[PDB]
Amino acid sequence: PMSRAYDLVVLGAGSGGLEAGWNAAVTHKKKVAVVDVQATHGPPLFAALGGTCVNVGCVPKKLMVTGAQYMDLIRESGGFGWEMDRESLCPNWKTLIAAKNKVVNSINESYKSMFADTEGLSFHMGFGALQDAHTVVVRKSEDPHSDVLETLDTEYILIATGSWPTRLGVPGDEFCITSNEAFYLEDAPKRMLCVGGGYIAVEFAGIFNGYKPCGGYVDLCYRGDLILRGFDTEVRKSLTKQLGANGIRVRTNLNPTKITKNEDGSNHVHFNDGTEEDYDQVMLAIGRVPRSQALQLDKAGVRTGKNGAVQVDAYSKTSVDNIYAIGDVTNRVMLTPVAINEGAAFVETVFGGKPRATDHTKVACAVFSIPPIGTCGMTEEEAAKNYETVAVYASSFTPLMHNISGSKHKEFMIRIITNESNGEVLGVHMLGDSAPEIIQSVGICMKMGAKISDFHSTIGVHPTSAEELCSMRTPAYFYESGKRVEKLS
Amino acid sequence: PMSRAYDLVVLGAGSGGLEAGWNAAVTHKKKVAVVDVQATHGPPLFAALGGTCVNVGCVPKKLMVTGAQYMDLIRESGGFGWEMDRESLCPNWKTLIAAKNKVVNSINESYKSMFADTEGLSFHMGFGALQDAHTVVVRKSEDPHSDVLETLDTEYILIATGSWPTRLGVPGDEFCITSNEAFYLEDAPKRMLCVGGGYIAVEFAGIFNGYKPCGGYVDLCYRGDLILRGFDTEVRKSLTKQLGANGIRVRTNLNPTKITKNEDGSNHVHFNDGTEEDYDQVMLAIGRVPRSQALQLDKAGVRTGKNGAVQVDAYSKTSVDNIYAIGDVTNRVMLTPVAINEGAAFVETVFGGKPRATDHTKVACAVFSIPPIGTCGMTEEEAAKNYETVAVYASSFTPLMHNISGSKHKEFMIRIITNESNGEVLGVHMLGDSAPEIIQSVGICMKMGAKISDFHSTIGVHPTSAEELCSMRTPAYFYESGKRVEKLS
Ligand SMILES: Cc1cc2nc3c(=O)[nH]c(=O)nc-3n(C[C@H](O)[C@H](O)[C@H](O)COP(=O)(O)OP(=O)(O)OC[C@H]3O[C@@H](n4cnc5c(N)ncnc54)[C@H](O)[C@@H]3O)c2cc1C
Ligand SMILES: Cc1cc2nc3c(=O)[nH]c(=O)nc-3n(C[C@H](O)[C@H](O)[C@H](O)COP(=O)(O)OP(=O)(O)OC[C@H]3O[C@@H](n4cnc5c(N)ncnc54)[C@H](O)[C@@H]3O)c2cc1C
Ligand SMILES: NCCCCc1cn(-c2ccc(-c3nc(CCc4ccccc4)cs3)c(OCCC3CCNCC3)c2)nn1
Ligand SMILES: NCCCCc1cn(-c2ccc(-c3nc(CCc4ccccc4)cs3)c(OCCC3CCNCC3)c2)nn1
Numbered sequence: 001p002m003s004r005a006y007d008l009v010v011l012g013a014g015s016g017g018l019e020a021g022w023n024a025a026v027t028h029k030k031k032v033a034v035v036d037v038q039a040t041h042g043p044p045l046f047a048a049l050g051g052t053c054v055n056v057g058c059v060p061k062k063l064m065v066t067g068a069q070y071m072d073l074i075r076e077s078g079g080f081g082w083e084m085d086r087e088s089l090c091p092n093w094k095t096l097i098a099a100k101n102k103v104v105n106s107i108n109e110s111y112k113s114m115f116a117d118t119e120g121l122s123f124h125m126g127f128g129a130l131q132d133a134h135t136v137v138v139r140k141s142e143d144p145h146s147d148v149l150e151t152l153d154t155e156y157i158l159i160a161t162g163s164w165p166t167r168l169g170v171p172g173d174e175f176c177i178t179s180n181e182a183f184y185l186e187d188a189p190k191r192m193l194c195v196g197g198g199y200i201a202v203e204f205a206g207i208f209n210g211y212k213p214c215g216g217y218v219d220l221c222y223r224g225d226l227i228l229r230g231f232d233t234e235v236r237k238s239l240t241k242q243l244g245a246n247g248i249r250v251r252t253n254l255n256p257t258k259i260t261k262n263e264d265g266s267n268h269v270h271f272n273d274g275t276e277e278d279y280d281q282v283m284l285a286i287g288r289v290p291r292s293q294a295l296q297l298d299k300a301g302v303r304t305g306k307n308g309a310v311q312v313d314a315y316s317k318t319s320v321d322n323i324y325a326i327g328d329v330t331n332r333v334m335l336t337p338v339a340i341n342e343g344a345a346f347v348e349t350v351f352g353g354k355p356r357a358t359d360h361t362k363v364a365c366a367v368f369s370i371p372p373i374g375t376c377g378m379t380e381e382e383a384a385k386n387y388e389t390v391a392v393y394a395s396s397f398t399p400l401m402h403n404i405s406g407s408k409h410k411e412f413m414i415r416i417i418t419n420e421s422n423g424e425v426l427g428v429h430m431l432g433d434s435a436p437e438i439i440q441s442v443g444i445c446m447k448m449g450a451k452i453s454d455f456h457s458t459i460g461v462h463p464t465s466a467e468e469l470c471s472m473r474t475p476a477y478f479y480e481s482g483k484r485v486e487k488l489s
Numbered sequence: 490p491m492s493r494a495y496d497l498v499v500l501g502a503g504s505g506g507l508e509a510g511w512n513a514a515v516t517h518k519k520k521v522a523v524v525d526v527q528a529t530h531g532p533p534l535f536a537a538l539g540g541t542c543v544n545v546g547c548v549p550k551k552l553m554v555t556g557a558q559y560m561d562l563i564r565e566s567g568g569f570g571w572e573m574d575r576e577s578l579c580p581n582w583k584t585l586i587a588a589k590n591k592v593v594n595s596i597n598e599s600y601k602s603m604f605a606d607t608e609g610l611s612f613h614m615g616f617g618a619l620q621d622a623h624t625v626v627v628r629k630s631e632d633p634h635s636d637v638l639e640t641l642d643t644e645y646i647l648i649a650t651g652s653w654p655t656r657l658g659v660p661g662d663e664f665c666i667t668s669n670e671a672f673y674l675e676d677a678p679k680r681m682l683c684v685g686g687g688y689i690a691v692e693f694a695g696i697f698n699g700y701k702p703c704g705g706y707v708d709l710c711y712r713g714d715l716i717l718r719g720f721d722t723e724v725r726k727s728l729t730k731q732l733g734a735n736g737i738r739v740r741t742n743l744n745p746t747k748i749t750k751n752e753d754g755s756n757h758v759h760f761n762d763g764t765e766e767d768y769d770q771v772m773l774a775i776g777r778v779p780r781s782q783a784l785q786l787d788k789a790g791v792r793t794g795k796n797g798a799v800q801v802d803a804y805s806k807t808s809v810d811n812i813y814a815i816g817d818v819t820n821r822v823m824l825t826p827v828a829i830n831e832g833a834a835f836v837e838t839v840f841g842g843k844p845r846a847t848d849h850t851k852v853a854c855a856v857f858s859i860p861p862i863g864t865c866g867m868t869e870e871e872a873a874k875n876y877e878t879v880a881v882y883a884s885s886f887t888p889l890m891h892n893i894s895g896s897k898h899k900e901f902m903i904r905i906i907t908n909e910s911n912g913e914v915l916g917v918h919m920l921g922d923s924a925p926e927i928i929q930s931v932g933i934c935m936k937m938g939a940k941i942s943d944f945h946s947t948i949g950v951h952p953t954s955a956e957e958l959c960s961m962r963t964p965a966y967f968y969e970s971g972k973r974v975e976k977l978s
Contacts, residue, residue, distance in 0.1 A: 053951065058951050058952045059889065059952060062890070062952045063889065063890060063893060066569065066890045066893075067569035067570065067893075070562070070565075070566035070569055070571050073559070073562050073563075073566070074562075074563065074566060074571065074573075076559075077559035077562070077563060079584075079588055080555065080556035080559055080580070080584070080585050080588065081556065081580050081581035081582060081583070081584030081585040081588070081700075082559050082563065082578070082580050082581075083577075083579070083580075083581050083584075084563075084573065084574065084577050084578055085573065085574060085577060088572075088573050088574060089571070089573055090572070091569070091570050091571050091572075092570035092571075092572050093570060094570070095568075095569070095570030095572075096569050096570040099568055099569065099570070099892075099893040100893070102892070102893075103889050103892050103893065106892070211570075335948075335951065336951040337948050337949040337950070337951050337956065338948060340949075341948055358948075359946075359948070363948040364947075364948070364950050365950060366950050366953065374950070400548065400552065400592050401551070401552060401555045403588075403591070403592050403595070404552060404555075404556075404588040404589070404591075404592065434923055434926040436950055436953050436955075437923040437926050437927050437953055437954060437955045438926050438927065438929065438930055438955075439930075439950060440927065440930075440947075440949065440950045440953055440955035440956055440958065440959070441927055441928075441929075441930030441931045441933070441934065441955060441958065442930045442933075443947050443948070443950065444930070444931075444934045444939065444943055444944060444947045444958070444959070445930065445933045445934055445937065447943060447946065447947050448934065448937050448939060448943050450933065450937060454933055454936060454937050455933060457848075457936065458853075458929075458932050458933045458936050459824075459826050459827060459830055459847075459848070459852040459853070459932070460826040460829075460929065461826070461853050461854060461855050461863070461925055461928060461929045461932065462542065462547050462824065462825040462826050463547045463548060463551045464855065464925050464926055464929055465926060466925075466926045466927075466929035466930060467826065467929055469929065469930065469933070470929070470933070
């Protein structure tokens with residue numbers, strides 16, 4: 001049947017969008033249109049071809065986290081007998097950004113190669129918006145009276161417009177920055193305030209701390225008692241302690257009430273406790289909400305809810321049968337590899353014939369803090385709620401190399417959460433160098449329903465930090481009927 | 490029954506010995522005597538309380554590998570904008586050794602605490618030798634006419650005397666060093682020749698290369714075509730290439746015929762090809778044979794064979810019923826965690842009542858080369874022999890951070906070997922930073938009989954090097970009836 005210009009229009013050329021578009025085009029010879037707002041990373045729109053991850057997320061972030069680590073690694077080299085002037089050690093921030101821009105730019109460039117070279121896959125630059133269930137309009141600007149560039153007549157629509165940082169909404173909010181603006185800063189700031197206690201706040205605290213000029217400092221300021229909500233409690237306390245030792249002042253039960261601009265350019269910040277303080281820059285990392293607010297979803301009749309989240313079934317389908325939505329715009333787990341899996345499972349479902357729903361349980365993630373976190377599965381707090389009897393295995397050690405490096409604060413931590421019944425591993429929570437690498441392969445065991453038996457029965461790899469997974473036999477303590485107990489009934 | 494001084498005498502206070510001794514003593518309240526030749530690391534005997542691993546193996550080696558990495562890491566920091574004088578960058582070897590000695594010393598010290606503090610576990614310093622099946626004699630020196638220090642009357646004997654470096658046996662052999670002597674060298678050598686192509690040769694090449702003074706160099710000289718026999722062929726070629734780029738000259742089908750001492754202290758080395766060359770030091774790493782040659786095993790009638798290996802059944806028992814032998818002295822897999830498992834499984838078998846034999850299949854190990862290797866299970870060469878149909882998955886990439894670091898030679902490599910029949914994963918072979926950490930948890934999956942299905946069905950952790958395990962769906966090529974084929978019948 002030769003009806004409609006495109007089989008599939010994809011709003012958002014990000015992690016979810018491109019996977020879907022590319023699969024649909026090459027493996028199922030479908031005609032696929034992919035809409036995004038710019039082809040290259042940067043202000044004023046930030047996101048681009050490749051999406052948030054490539055342009056202003058996972059990729060550039062980890063490049064910069066890697067950069068800031070050299071501060072620690074250079075300190076540490078001295079114990080191993082690397083004499084070299086430590087007074088001459090101020091990192092050049094401009095050289096880092098240049099390098100990071102070069103790398104992101106080459107990815108954007110390799111995505112233009114993809115489109116020109118791949119048959120039946122076209123890229124449409126502007127602002128997508130629905131008109132009906134079968135029509136997506138592309139505009140110059142997001143202002144819905146902007147000149148219309150293209151009207152894409154399509155059989156299926158896939159909404160993959162991702163998410164956008166949330167603002168603080170107080171007198172002074174417009175003088176603060178976010179992840180987006182942080183990546184283009186001309187100079188590393190001397191006096192830096194990271195507002196928030198989520199993984200972005202923490203990762204960027206670590207970056208700024210590494211790239212701070214001589215005499216500078218980083219405060220991390222959080223609404224609540226303990227940073228990294230929904231992470232292992234003892235891992236969060238240990239990281240709080242290690243950010244401290246690395247020179248990051250963590251402040252809790254603290255919220256800016258007001259920001260005003262000083263004469264030199266810096267920002268005055270009033271807080272809850274009465275305290276006033278001056279910062280060269282103030283970065284809000286207080287959450288990310290879906291971008292559905294300009295897609296005019298009301299017009300097509302696709303179902304919205306909790307903060308513009310696209311209401312979606314297991315197979316990613318909206319209220320309208322031909323319109324699907326994946327990634328951060330759905331407001332489930334906001335990770336790149338999830339969106340990629342949802343997009344892959346969308347093409348298999350609709351165009352493959354072979355239906356599949358993404359599996360959201362025990363998906364491993366990481367925090368690229370200094371030091372880093374690797375986690376997969378559930379905290380002991382939620383295990384003790386959903387499970388009769390729960391064993392908590394726990395082990396903390398300092399790798400011998402830190403007796404030499406001077407970094408004696410760098411406790412490596414592993415906690416495993418069990419179902420007593422059958423030994424099943426419900427959660428693994430690691431803090432320390434290499435954790436994100438180790439957890440990936442933990443995530444495979446946990447997928448295969450690994451019991452604690454399966455860990456301690458594995459011959460170890462010496463000397464390693466991971467070999468301590470296979471040395472955890474005796475539980476530290478338990479939970480029967482969701483209350484902590486010294487020992488088991 | 491109150492008969493015999495000790496339930497158990499353990500010749501060798503190493504990885505195997507101490508595990509066995511300690512388990513027997515605390516968990517089974519047995520009376521345990523542990524014999525070793527000195528309580529502290531160092532010349533002229535090197536090994537000590539804690540064994541080869543703690544004193545002159547895994548532990549000090551990795552400390553020094555960690556040290557040498559700083560050479561690369563400091564180079565790499567520049568791309569991320571770490572300005573600092575690179576002309577002022579010669580590592581102080583004396584500071585490294587001091588530090589490494591401090592660390593090993595504290596372990597030796599913590600093992601004396603263990604003995605004094607632990608009831609029914611005594612330490613007997615000298616040279617063990619059998620007299621009969623129930624009597625171990627301890628002598629001042631290994632000369633079997635040395636003054637006798639103790640006669641230990643015992644019900645069970647456990648031989649855990651480990652192994653010892655092999656010599657080259659040519660005119661000049663006595664002027665060369667080994668792993669043992671390398672660890673106490675007063676100065677880092679300017680012109681270093683590592684003879685051998687085993688993991689020790691390669692790891693030490695990397696150390697010397699990091700700690701070489703200004704203008705110095707390291708040659709790695711190997712008998713055969715390709716270093717690291719019994720490793721993935723494409724991993725060995727890739728590492729050969731990366732040692733090259735890191736400044737190590739690899740030489741193959743090359744063997745020293747003769748070494749003589751020069752006037753200044755250096756060594757003249759004649760080779761096969763006719764070539765003569767001068768080296769400040771020459772380190773032989775050409776294999777390790779059991780220490781059974783002074784235990785006078787002939788007297789007790791315990792069965793020897795291939796190079797003094799103690800002939801042993803699955804449960805570690807010698808020809809004599811009450812005498813067992815574990816670790817490198819058996820000449821199976823010569824790794825610390827194996828010996829520890831054999832010792833643990835000896836105490837459970839004999840003293841526990843609950844018999845168990847160590848499982849030697851798909852045990853993950855690592856090479857602390859620069860860059861490092863993580864491997865578990867079988868090469869495609871032996872898979873293609875023992876299996877009808879074999880799939881080989883393979884992927885090589887350069888992490889984006891090396892576009893910035895300048896280290897563009899640092900290809901990260903993963904190869905998986907499958908049984909086509911059922912998808913089972915028979916082998917995983919990784920080269921690159923973090924590999925030894927990643928392989929540990931691969932070793933758990935492979936223990937649980939993971940299929941390739943189980944890998945690619947796992948949501949990935951972004952951005953990571955390990956997430957490329959879960960992105961390998963299409964085999965690179967196969968093997969039916971042990972011959973390589975482009976594609977499958
Ligand atoms: C600072 C930061 C760090 C992160 N680090 C990690 C990490 O380490 N690991 C990880 O797994 N995840 C990480 N994430 C999360 C990751 O970026 C997202 O989960 C992922 O990008 C979501 O993919 P998506 O397909 O939902 O949308 P995106 O990848 O965000 O793609 C959405 C695209 O839609 C476009 N778009 C928006 N509106 C329109 C419109 N009207 N018309 C057309 N196009 C439009 C945007 O320009 C954008 O390019 C990070 C996120 C941030 C912000
Ligand atoms: C340089 C090097 C690096 C290594 N790196 C690693 C690594 O990274 N990972 C890994 O898993 N393995 C590694 N190994 C291997 C590891 O050291 C051995 O596999 C392990 O130590 C074997 O333990 P064992 O119990 O068999 O004996 P050992 O640990 O060697 O203990 C034997 C002990 O017996 C004592 N002894 C000898 N003869 C007598 C006697 N007559 N009387 C009394 N005592 C005696 C010795 O003094 C010694 O202390 C390495 C080995 C070397 C040499
Ligand atoms: N007519 C059919 C045959 C067409 C055949 C065809 C391929 N390309 C083509 C073009 C590009 C890419 C990519 N590049 C990156 C960025 C990688 C990068 C960039 C710079 C430096 C280092 C690394 C991610 S993806 C690509 O990968 C396919 C996978 C998918 C994964 C899901 N997302 C989209 C890409 C295929 N050009 N022609
Ligand atoms: N009467 C019964 C109760 C006795 C109770 C009792 C314990 N100790 C005791 C004493 C020592 C150690 C060790 N230390 C290291 C070295 C660790 C180290 C050293 C320096 C710096 C950093 C790290 C390895 S092991 C130990 O660990 C038990 C496990 C075993 C594992 C198998 N090998 C032997 C030790 C127990 N002292 N008193």
